[PDB]
Nucleic acid binder design. Structure first.
Lengths: 148, 82, 205, 71, 80, 123, 129, 155
RNA sequence: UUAGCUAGUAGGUGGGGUAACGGCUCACCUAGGCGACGAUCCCUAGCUGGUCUGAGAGGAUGACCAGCCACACUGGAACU
RNA sequence: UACCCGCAGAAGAAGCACCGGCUAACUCCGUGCCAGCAGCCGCGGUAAUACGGAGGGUGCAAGCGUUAAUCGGAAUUACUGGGCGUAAAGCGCACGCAGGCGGUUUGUUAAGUCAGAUGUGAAAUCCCCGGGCUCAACCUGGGAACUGCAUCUGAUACUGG
């Protein structure tokens, strides 16, 4: 069966339930870890299975377009919001950080708490939150701009 | 050893066999020594469908070449046809 | 895979009747036949050498209902074949089943004949052939199958056919709704204001 | 289409760079590279290194502007 | 069945061996000119009867050393 | 000229030097936006052309055009670039692929949409 | 130096012919005499003679038609700097057979046509039309 | 029955006190479809006067080529100023595969089956000049026989 | 914009060795062997049938199929 | 499963690029050296068929465009098949080793060259005429081709000894 989670799509390769390494069938009650999806989905969302994957490809790509359109939208606003070529005062000095957490649930959750410690004087911002581990383009990301 | 057998060419769902003499270890569609017949299982049978150079098959047997179950059948079938 | 839009536009652009309608009507009472489609139809094309070659190829394609890919492949085969390439191109077109069905008068148009073919109304040698581009051979017998024989389209189609010039290389029995592709048509059988060599020129450059 | 985020703010010619180029300092805040508008160049209109001038600035690049109003 | 080569002795220094050069003309694969090519062969000369400059007839045989797979058949012309 | 000469020194075809080396024989490459700015073009033209400097996944850093009217791109924007010079912009040898990755489509395009990453408008 | 006397022969013909000369003469040689033979036999010159014994001078009587030279083109093919040999089935023909190629075979010098018919190949000495 | 083909029309210009004077040039070929070809080139202030002057030139100044059943005798090379030209007698069925400038010449000439190609400058006036001369110097199985003084099989 | 390279090196005798010829190995002897027809050194690379292109000659190429080779985490080794 | 029969209704099935010249396809409105286009030339300051929208049209069509990539056109590395006075190109000049080439006659040789015979050049691929899947792609029989290499036997004009 083809499963679609958010803007991610794919066929399930295997199923894992808790300690149990393999389960053949899963009911509405007991939770089962899903595997074989294209990429790490959102921390949470509504998931719906489909009959065929081909029909679900355009839908998944459609959700990406909207999420990308709003991404560039929120990017243009924040930059234009100042309505001036620079900051009115001397808070321009900032610190950059690079974060990749193994779990998808944390990166969205703790970042909100990481924006709570932000102040007017020193501004901190997250760049390139990862789904897990570390990678070449991530270390390169910290190479261009000095960051932890 | 040396064996006489069917190397399966043709296309998907439309098998067509090339009868070949070869070292039994080589892959089925791989290196062979001599081609010696063919076998179309999908022939309309209005015309041909199975052709064997029985002279060279026997020559190779005479030198110890073995023969597939399926080629052993073809040979009995073709010997019956004429 | 088929041209589905307005048809008389095509005739109007090529400057000639392409027989894309039954022929029940003088074409000039259905469209402004001698004027191209569009805002600037009255405008004259001071037409380049490439232009005349293109339009001639389009003309033939639009007559037979063939899109570019298949038609190019038709040229390739005409070229490979022995004898004059230009003439070989027209033999190949004229041997198509949708075409032959039209020439025996089973269809009012090649479009209608093609539908007959696709919809399993045509047999070749008592065998059902339902692909339009099926190449028909000398001595073949194409027929309307029994169940399609009472279709009124076919009777009308045979009536109109009786009023067109009658093709030499086909023997048609209107009663049985069967007919025989006697031989490949010669060049001399086919219209003389087709300029194949232009099409041949277009595809060699 | 042509968006409309253009502006017409003024300023004063500062430098007399090469190929109808100037340092034009915007009365507003700073100065920009300012190049001479096609129109203006077609109608000649030399432009001394110290004139009040009108500039067309695309937010896209505030750093640059075209001289519209001759003097 | 006596396949054979003819060439001249460029070195006779070695004990019981000789170096023979076989020269031939060959059409150039691209530019058509006929070019000289040479093939030097280490050959066996038991008895060392072959002098440098000699023209000798040689044949191919089994390996006699790391580099000798040819032996002398007979001398043709000598001491030019 | 001489046969003899060619026999000593064969005809030797010149190796074509590429116009998009940063692509390294790939159809597109991905990269991060280093600077996003405007620049003026060469005689006889005049404008404020949108370009960006982009560090590619293979280390190369190049300037790339951002075609179309309007764009929402900034530093750290991850974009896709393709071959294609901008003639009145010397140095500019690549184009940005509108409507891929972080680069949005052109707003409100109706003609030539696919060259500007614009979906077909419901209608 | 004088390293190709056949090109020299071809050229003396070509130039005297171009210069509407009645005849041309050159130091002789068997190989020249063999070529002159083919030219005459195929009607590209009138006739020829060699005179002297110790320093033989060969003489070719040229041929003209409509106040035109019978010999339209005459070019060296194989040459000291690039020998050209052909097989029987590879023998060129000049002007689609209207002209000739002079070929040197194990059986002496003859035309492409002759050598072809006699199952031979050889060194392609020149073309003549 | 003579066949005539317009190969190229071009605008040149002459400068005087008052400014530029524009005129036109026309390059044409006439042929009898059976071995005779002429090319013409005319100049005039208006295009029709130029295309017409050229035909007039093309009709005289015409030459003969020794065709062979609608195809050439042997491969031929032609040359004139920038244009090196090359032609081959193809088998039957091929037709004329060639550039525009040459095709027009070969078509009106009656050369039914040929492989052609132009090298270097494709300047039409010199390309056609080079083709005509190629066909013109093209000799015939009979003349070489006459030349060589023998009517062997090669006749 | 690499001109010199080589001591098992080249050959000879004899012992050993391999399934088998062989500096394969060892001792002794001779002083050879390679190289501007490109050795040595440096860079790159699995080779072919064929594939794509070209009228051709060529140019480019070596997925899929088939033949040969080489490798099996890296370096080395032998046992059966 | 292929395939055959039956039922329902046009019913569930059309998009992409282009239209200044090269290059098939033209107008209006908007903009005004801006916003923008751009393979090459080159478009844009008030009539823009070149920008952007529209109507119209052209070319493709389950694809259409853009990018990347090889060869072609490119006779633009020219063996086939180019050049060096003034366009890129004669070393400032001479001597000269290696190398390339070498006047004319006879005999000899037979390496080059030429001829014939024999073996080999795997199959598949390419090509030709057929056969089989409704056609085509595809599959397949036979042929031709593999223009090459090698051995033997001859020919001796040309090149070499």
């Amino acid at each position: 069966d083809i499963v679609l989670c958010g803007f991610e799509y794919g066929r399930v390769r295997a199923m894992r339930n808790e300690l149990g390494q393999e389960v053949l069938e899963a009911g509405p009650s007991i939770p089962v870890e899903i595997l074989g999806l294209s990429g790490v989905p959102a921390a949470g969302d509504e998931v719906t299975v489909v009959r065929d994957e081909k029909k679900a490809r355009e839908v998944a790509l459609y959700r990406q377009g909207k999420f990308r359109e709003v991404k560039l939208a929120r990017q243009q606003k924040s930059k234009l919001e100042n309505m001036f070529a620079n900051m009115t005062e001397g808070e321009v000095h900032e610190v950059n950080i690079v974060l990749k957490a193994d779990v998808q649930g944390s990166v969205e959750a703790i970042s909100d708490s990481l924006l709570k410690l932000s102040t007017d004087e020193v501004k901190v911002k997250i760049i390139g939150s990862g789904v897990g581990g570390i990678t070449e383009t991530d270390a390169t990301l910290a190479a261009a701009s000095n960051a932890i | 050893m040396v064996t006489i057998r069917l190397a399966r060419h043709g296309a998907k769902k439309r098998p067509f066999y090339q009868v070949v003499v070869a070292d039994s270890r080589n892959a089925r569609n791989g290196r062979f020594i001599e081609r010696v017949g063919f076998f179309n299982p999908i022939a309309s049978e209005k015309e041909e469908g199975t052709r064997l150079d029985l002279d060279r098959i026997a020559h190779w047997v005479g030198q110890g070449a073995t023969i597939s179950d399926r080629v052993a059948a073809l040979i009995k079938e073709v010997n019956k046809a004429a | 895979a088929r041209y589905l839009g307005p048809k008389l536009k095509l005739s109007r652009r090529e400057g000639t009747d392409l027989f894309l309608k039954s022929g029940v009507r003088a074409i000039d009472t259905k469209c402004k036949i001698e004027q191209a489609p569009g805002q600037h139809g009255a405008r004259k094309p001071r037409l380049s050498d490439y232009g005349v070659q293109l339009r001639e190829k389009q003309k033939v394609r639009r007559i037979y209902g063939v899109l570019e890919r298949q038609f190019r492949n038709y040229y390739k085969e005409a070229a490979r074949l022995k004898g004059n390439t230009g003439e070989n191109l027209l033999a190949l077109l004229e041997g198509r089943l949708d075409n032959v069905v039209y020439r025996m008068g089973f269809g009012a148009t090649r479009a209608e004949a093609r539908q007959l073919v696709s919809h399993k109304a045509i047999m070749v040698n008592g065998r059902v052939v339902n692909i339009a581009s099926y190449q028909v051979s000398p001595n073949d017998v194409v027929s309307i199958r029994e169940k399609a024989k009472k279709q009124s389209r076919v009777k009308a189609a045979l009536e109109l056919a009786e009023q067109r010039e009658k093709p030499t290389w086909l023997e048609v029995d209107a009663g049985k709704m069967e007919g025989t592709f006697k031989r490949k048509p010669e060049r001399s059988d086919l219209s003389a204001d087709i300029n194949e060599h232009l099409i041949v020129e277009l595809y060699s450059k | 289409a042509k968006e409309k985020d253009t502006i017409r703010t003024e300023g004063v010619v500062t430098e007399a760079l090469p190929n109808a180029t100037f340092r034009v300092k915007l009365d507003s805040g700073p100065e920009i590279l300012a190049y001479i508008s096609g129109k203006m160049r077609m109608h000649y209109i030399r432009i001394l290194p110290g004139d009040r001038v009108v500039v067309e600035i695309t937010p896209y690049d505030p750093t640059r502007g075209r001289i519209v109003y001759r003097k | 069945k006596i396949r054979t080569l003819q060439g001249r002795v460029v070195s006779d220094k070695m004990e019981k061996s000789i170096v023979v050069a076989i020269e031939r003309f060959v059409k150039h694969p691209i530019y058509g000119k006929f070019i000289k090519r040479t093939t030097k062969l280490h050959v066996h000369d038991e008895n060392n009867e072959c002098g440098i400059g000699d023209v000798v007839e040689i044949r191919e045989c089994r390996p006699l050393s790391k580099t000798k797979s040819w032996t002398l058949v007979r001398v043709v012309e000598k001491a030019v | 000229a001489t046969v003899n000469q060619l026999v000593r020194k064969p005809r030797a075809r010149k190796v074509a030097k590429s116009n998009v080396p940063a692509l390294e024989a790939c159809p597109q490459k991905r990269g991060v936006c280093t600077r996003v700015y405007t620049t003026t073009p060469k005689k006889p033209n005049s404008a404020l052309r949108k370009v960006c400097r982009v560090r590619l996944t293979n280390g190369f850093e190049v300037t790339s055009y951002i075609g179309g009217e309007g764009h929402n791109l900034q530093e750290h924007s991850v974009i896709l670039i393709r071959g294609g010079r901008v003639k009145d912009l010397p140095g500019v040898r690549y184009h940005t692929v509108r409507g891929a990755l972080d680069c949005s489509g052109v707003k409100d395009r109706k003609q030539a949409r696919s060259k500007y990453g614009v979906k077909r408008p419901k209608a | 130096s004088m390293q190709d006397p056949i090109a020299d022969m071809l050229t003396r013909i070509r130039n005297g012919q171009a210069a509407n000369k009645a005849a041309v003469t050159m130091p002789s040689s068997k190989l020249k005499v063999a070529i002159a033979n083919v030219l005459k036999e195929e009607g590209f010159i009138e006739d020829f003679k060699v005179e002297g014994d110790t320093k033989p001078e060969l003489e070719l009587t040229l041929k003209y038609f409509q106040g035109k030279a019978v010999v339209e083109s005459i070019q060296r093919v194989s040459r000291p700097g690039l020998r050209i040999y052909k097989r029987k089935d590879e023998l060129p023909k000049v002007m689609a057979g209207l002209g000739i190629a002079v070929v040197s075979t194990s059986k002496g010098v003859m035309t492409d046509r002759a050598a072809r018919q006699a199952g031979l190949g050889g060194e392609i000495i020149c073309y003549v039309a | 029955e003579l066949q005539e083909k317009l190969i190229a029309v071009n605008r040149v210009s002459k400068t005087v006190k008052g400014g530029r004077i524009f005129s036109f040039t026309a390059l044409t070929v006439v042929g009898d479809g059976n071995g005779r070809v002429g090319f013409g080139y005319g100049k005039a202030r208006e295009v029709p006067a130029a295309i017409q002057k050229a035909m007039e030139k093309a009709r005289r100044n015409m030459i003969n080529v020794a065709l062979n059943n609608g195809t050439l005798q042997h491969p031929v090379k032609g040359v004139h100023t920038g244009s090196r030209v090359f032609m081959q007698p193809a088998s039957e069925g091929t037709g004329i595969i060639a550039g525009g400038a040459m095709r027009a010449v070969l078509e009106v000439a009656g050369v039914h089956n040929v492989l052609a190609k132009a090298y270097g400058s494709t300047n039409p006036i010199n390309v056609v000049r080079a083709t005509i001369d190629g066909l013109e110097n093209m000799n015939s199985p009979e003349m070489v026989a006459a030349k060589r003084g023998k009517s062997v099989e090669e006749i």
